[PDB]
Amino acid sequence: SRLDKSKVINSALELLNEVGIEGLTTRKLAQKLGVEQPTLYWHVKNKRALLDALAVEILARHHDYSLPAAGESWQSFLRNNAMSFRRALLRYRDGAKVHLGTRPDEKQYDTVETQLRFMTENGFSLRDGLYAISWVSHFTLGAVLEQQEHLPPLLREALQIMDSDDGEQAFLHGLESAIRGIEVQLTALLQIV
Amino acid sequence: SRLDKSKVINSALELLNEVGIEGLTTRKLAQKLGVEQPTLYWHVKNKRALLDALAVEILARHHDYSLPAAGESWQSFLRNNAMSFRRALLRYRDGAKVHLGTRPDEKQYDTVETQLRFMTENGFSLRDGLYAISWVSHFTLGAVLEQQEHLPPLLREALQIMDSDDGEQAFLHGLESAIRGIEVQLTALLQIV
Ligand SMILES: [Cl-]
Ligand SMILES: [Cl-]
Ligand code: NA
Numbered sequence: 203s204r205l206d207k208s209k210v211i212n213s214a215l216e217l218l219n220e221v222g223i224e225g226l227t228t229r230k231l232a233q234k235l236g237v238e239q240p241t242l243y244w245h246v247k248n249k250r251a252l253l254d255a256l257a258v259e260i261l262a263r264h265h266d267y268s269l270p271a272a273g274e275s276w277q278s279f280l281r282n283n284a285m286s287f288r289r290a291l292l293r294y295r296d297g298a299k300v301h302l303g304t305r306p307d308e309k310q311y312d313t314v315e316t317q318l319r320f321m322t323e324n325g326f327s328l329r330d331g332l333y334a335i336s337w338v339s340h341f342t343l344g345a346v347l348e349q350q351e352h353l354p355p356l357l358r359e360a361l362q363i364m365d366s367d368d369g370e371q372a373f374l375h376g377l378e379s380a381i382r383g384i385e386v387q388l389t390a391l392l393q394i395v
Numbered sequence: 396s397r398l399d400k401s402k403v404i405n406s407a408l409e410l411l412n413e414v415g416i417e418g419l420t421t422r423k424l425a426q427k428l429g430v431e432q433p434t435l436y437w438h439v440k441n442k443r444a445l446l447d448a449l450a451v452e453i454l455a456r457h458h459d460y461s462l463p464a465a466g467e468s469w470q471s472f473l474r475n476n477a478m479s480f481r482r483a484l485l486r487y488r489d490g491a492k493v494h495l496g497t498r499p500d501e502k503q504y505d506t507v508e509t510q511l512r513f514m515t516e517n518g519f520s521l522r523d524g525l526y527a528i529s530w531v532s533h534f535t536l537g538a539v540l541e542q543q544e545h546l547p548p549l550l551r552e553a554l555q556i557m558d559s560d561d562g563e564q565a566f567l568h569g570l571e572s573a574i575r576g577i578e579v580q581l582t583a584l585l586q587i588v
């Protein structure tokens with residue numbers, strides 16, 4: 203009904219699944235909604251505006267582990283947050299590309315602030331706390347982007363394991379390797395590690 | 396001169412820097428080259444073909460640490476290869492997007508085969524060897540993609556450090572955390588770690 207912000211966004215998310223991020227246009231949204239382009243332009247000025255809104259919505263609907271639980275270890279937080287971020291990005295076609303193409307908003311910023319506070323209370327310097335969250339982000343993004351976009355002996359015989367599964371195993375394994383690296387760096391303090 | 400494969404690719408790389416990946420079109424390449432569209436179509440059928448060629452070329456020109464040196468430790472290999480991959484992707488506008496949007500070729504495949512052999516001779520199972528290389532890839536890709544695409548207390552006071560530098564420090568730090576994670580998993584063998 204018909205041009206509520208929430209309805210434009212929901213039709214635009216449907217459209218995103220049909221046509222992908224490069225195909226998504228305000229012209230096709232207006233057609234989908236049954237409305238003339240000037241009518242829609244009142245509500246959504248351009249594709250950049252649209253895409254910004256979609257990015258926010260994807261995370262608001264699906265990124266349910268954005269914040270640490272009470273008593274939770276920093277390791278669990280990063281593991282749960284990473285898994286949640288990946289799931290959220292995998293829900294819509296080109297979901298990672300939508301996330302990438304947008305500047306953060308007051309939400310992301312506010313959420314990241316609480317995450318930095320959390321990490322610092324657990325012994326991280328601001329910088330290592332920030333490097334940690336960023337790395338998990340970059341790693342999760344790269345994995346999903348590769349998953350969503352799309353012969354020699356050894357590569358063959360390993361691929362029978364990488365391909366009965368859509369990236370999760372590798373992602374989860376790499377995530378544990380990083381976490382343990384952070385644990386080791388954290389615990390070393392001023393010592394050579 | 397004028398439509399050699401190598402000359403089409405070099406003009407197309409120049410064009411990529413001017414207009415970016417979504418703007419890049421065979422129509423603008425033909426204009427740049429001074430040739431009619433049917434003439435160019437003989438040589439390059441479509442943008443997908445073009446982009447595939449560009450992806451290969453970027454790595455061939457700049458990804459100079461694709462293979463391990465004689466006597467090199469697996470840790471050095473992953474560190475040097477990662478740094479090389481990131482540098483190569485940062486050379487052209489939308490370079491990571493160009494890399495992402497392409498299926499690998501006989502080169503990438505052949506190179507990855509030699510990397511798997513290398514990793515396996517250093518104690519990695521095929522799967523952990525493969526997970527390792529993939530993670531480094533995903534992490535490097537995510538970082539560069541974020542770098543190439545584009546206020547609360549603690550985020551502020553950390554950002555004065557993340558932003559006098561274009562991602563390298565964070566990237567290098569996260570890379571060491573992963574490597575140490577792999578070292579720990581490698582060394583544990585069948586023990587609880
Ligand atoms: Cl209605
Ligand atoms: Cl000439
Ligand atoms: Na973003």
Ligand code: NA
Nearest residue numbers: 494495497498
């Ligand atoms: Na690729």
